[PDB]
């Protein structure tokens, strides 16, 4: 999703600002880590370190699946596979089922 990410507890004082400038737009990129989109697990590390340059591989395993609203955690079987982009090497894909 958009919106930038990052850094910590955002301290702003209102005792210092001015009735003025728009407080610039932060050309920072939106770089989400694979270990910080999903839940960290010692299998998904072994997926990513295999996926980051690996040629081809699938692994089926019982994981923790965060539910879509952060209320709940469910446990299910994920069979996922991956392959590199045959052309450029600036990506590699994973269909998750």
Partner 1 sequence: KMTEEECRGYYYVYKDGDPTQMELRPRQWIHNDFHFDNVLSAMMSLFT
Partner 2 sequence: LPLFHIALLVLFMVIIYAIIGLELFKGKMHKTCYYIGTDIVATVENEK
Partner 3 sequence: HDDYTNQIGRFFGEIDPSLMRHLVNISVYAFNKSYDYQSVCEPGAA
Ligand X SMILES: *[C@@H]1O[C@H](CO)[C@@H](O)[C@H](O)[C@H]1NC(C)=O
**Sites of contact with partner 3 (CB under 8 A):** 1, 3-6, 9-13, 15-16, 32, 36, 39-40, 64, 66, 70, 73
- Positions that interact with partner 2 (CB under 8 A): 14-19
Minimum distance between the CB of residue 12 and partner 2, rounded to whole angstroms?
A: 13
CA dist., res. 47 & res. 41, Å (int) = 10
Tokens of 26: 């932060």
Partner in contact with 66, chosen from partner 1, ligand X, partner 3, none, beta carbon below 5 to 8 Å by kind: partner 3
CA dist., res. 60 & res. 37, Å (int) = 19
Give the one residue of 11, 13, 20, 91 binding partner 1; rule: CB under 8 A.
20
Strand order from edge to edge, sheet including 73-84:
57-66, 73-84, 92-96
Give the one residue of 23, 26, 27, 67 binding partner 1; rule: CB under 8 A.
23
CA dist., res. 10 & res. 60, Å (int) = 40
């Amino acid at each position: 999703q958009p919106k930038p990410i990052g850094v910590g507890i955002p301290t702003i004082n209102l005792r210092k600002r001015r009735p003025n400038v728009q407080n610039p737009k932060s050309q920072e990129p939106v770089t989400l880590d694979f270990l910080d989109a999903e839940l960290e697990n010692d299998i998904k590390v072994e997926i990513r370190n295999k996926m980051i340059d690996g040629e081809s591989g699938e692994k089926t395993f019982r994981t923790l699946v965060k539910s879509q609203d952060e209320r709940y955690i469910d446990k299910g079987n994920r069979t996922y596979t991956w392959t590199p982009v045959n052309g450029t090497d600036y990506s590699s894909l994973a269909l998750v089922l």
